[PDB]
Design a protein around this ligand. Structure first.
Ligand SMILES: [Zn+2]
Ligand SMILES: [Zn+2]
Ligand SMILES: [Zn+2]
Lengths: 258, 258
C-alpha cells in the first residue's frame, strides 16, 4: 500500500528540519527531493513513507562480494519501492534497476578553496602539490576508474594509490576537507552540489573549469516495478510545467547566502 | 534483417556528403547521427538502412485526426524501426513511442542577427518591432503552446496569431529568415543548433540569454520494440566512454568556421 521511498541526507535534496524532533513521519524532512517526492506521489496517486538509506551511500557493487550497497541496494534487494534522490543514471546501475528520464542535468566538476592555482582537470593531473579525490561508492569514482582518456586516466592512477586516502564517505566530508586544507585539497563532485555549496557561507569555495561529462539524475525503481511507467511520465510532465526549474531556484539560489 | 532507421536532414546531425551523387546507401550521408547510428549498430550487432523522413518533420499530432506525422509517425505506424536524430524527449511523444536515456542535453534558446536589441525572452515579449517564431510540428512550438509561465504565455499569444506566420518548416528556413531580416526577426530553436550555426559563416548570428528549459534528445523506437532495451544501454555506454562528447566536438567546433 504505502510506497517506501529510500533517499539520502544530502543538502539541499533532503535535510532534517530544525524542529524535526517534534514532527512526525515525512514532515520531519525538507528539501528539493522532499518537495519532488510529494509531487511525484500526488501525480501518480500513491501514499509514501520517506526513509534514509541505512549505509548512507548512493550505490555501487562490491567487487568480490558482488552485493549492491546504498540506495541501489535497497531497491535491488526489495527494501524500498522507489528512490528519490540525486542518484546518477549510469550503465552499471541501469543494468540492475530502472530509471525515469532525468529530472536534473549535471556533470562532474572541480571544487577548490578560493585562491587555489587550479583551473581544470588537466591542471590537477599535471601537478602533485594539491591532492584531490572523490566520494566513495558512487558514479564519480567509477567514472575515473573506467575512463580511457589520458587526463582522467592519469588522475585515477594517482587517486587510487594516494596515501592517506583522498576519497571521502560523504559530500559534506569532501567539502570540509577542501575548506580546511588551505588550498591543498580539491574535490571532484557533481556540478549540482558544487554550485549549491558555492552559495553557502563561509563562501570560501568555487567551481572551476567546465564539467568533465554530461549526465543526469533519475528516480529509480526495482526492475519490473509497476510504478516505473507512471513515475517516468510524472517526471516529464513536471519538467515541462517548470516545477523542476522552480524547485532548483528555491533550494539553490532563492536561499543563497553569498 | 536490416533495421530501417528514420532520420532527418539537419546539419550537423545528418547531411549529404559533398560527393553523394557518386555514393550509395548509408555512404551518401555524414554527420553526428550518422556516426552515432554506426556506433550503435556495431554494439548492438545489426545491419541498418538510413532513410530520410518523408515529410521532413520531427513529429506532432494532428488535433483533428489525431494522426502523428514526422519521424514519430513513421515509428508509430511501423514505417521505421528506429529513429536516430535530434528528436526531443517529451511527454506527448513518450506516450506513443519509446525513448532511450538522452544522448544530448539542451534547451530552447534565442537566435538573433548580430546587433539586434534583444538579450532575453522577456525582451522579445515586450516589443513588436522584432517578430519571432519557432519550427512547426515540433517540441519547441508545443512548449510555448503549453506554457503557463507569464513571459512564454504572452509570447505564444503573439506567435499563434502573428501574420504573416512567424513559424517555419525547417531550421534552415528559420536561420535564413533571421539573416535576411536585418534583425527584425528572432528565431527560437534548441541550443544545440543555435551554437552550431553561431560557428558557421557568414558568422552573423548569435545565441543570446540562457536556455528557457532543460531537456534532451533520445533514440526512439516503437512501443514494445525488441531494440529498445539494448539501444538504451548502448547510449549510456557510449556516453560513459566519451564517444558522445568526442562526436560533439568533431561536428560542432573542429569544423567551426568562425
Ligand atoms: Zn503537481
Ligand atoms: Zn564503439
Ligand atoms: Zn488536420
Amino acid at each position: 500500500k504505502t510506497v517506501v521511498v529510500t533517499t539520502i541526507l544530502e543538502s539541499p535534496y533532503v535535510m532534517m528540519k530544525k524542529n524535526h524532533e517534534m514532527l512526525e513521519g515525512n514532515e520531519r524532512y525538507e528539501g528539493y527531493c522532499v518537495d519532488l517526492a510529494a509531487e511525484i506521489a500526488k501525480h501518480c496517486g500513491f501514499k509514501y513513507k520517506l526513509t534514509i538509506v541505512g549505509d548512507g551511500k548512493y550505490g555501487a557493487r562490491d567487487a568480490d562480494t558482488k552485493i549492491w550497497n546504498g540506495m541501489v541496494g535497497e531497491l535491488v534487494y526489495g527494501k524500498a519501492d522507489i528512490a528519490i534522490a540525486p542518484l546518477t543514471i549510469t550503465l552499471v546501475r541501469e543494468e540492475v534497476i530502472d530509471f525515469s528520464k532525468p529530472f536534473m542535468s549535471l556533470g562532474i566538476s572541480i571544487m577548490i578553496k578560493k585562491g587555489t592555482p587550479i583551473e581544470s582537470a588537466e591542471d590537477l593531473s599535471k601537478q602533485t602539490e594539491i591532492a584531490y579525490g572523490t566520494l566513495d561508492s558512487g558514479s564519480t569514482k567509477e567514472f575515473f576508474r573506467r575512463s580511457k582518456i589520458a587526463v582522467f586516466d592519469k588522475m585515477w592512477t594517482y587517486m587510487r594509490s594516494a596515501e592517506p586516502s583522498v576519497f571521502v564517505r560523504t559530500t559534506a566530508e569532501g567539502v570540509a576537507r577542501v575548506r580546511k586544507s588551505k588550498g591543498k585539497y580539491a574535490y571532484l563532485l557533481e556540478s549540482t552540489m558544487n554550485e549549491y555549496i558555492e552559495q553557502r557561507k563561509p563562501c570560501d569555495t568555487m567551481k572551476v573549469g567546465g564539467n568533465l561529462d554530461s549526465k543526469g539524475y533519475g528516480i529509480a525503481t526495482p526492475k519490473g516495478s509497476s510504478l516505473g511507467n507512471a513515475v517516468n511520465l510524472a517526471v516529464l510532465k513536471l519538467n515541462e510545467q517548470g516545477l523542476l526549474d522552480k524547485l532548483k531556484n528555491k533550494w539553490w539560489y532563492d536561499k543563497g547566502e553569498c
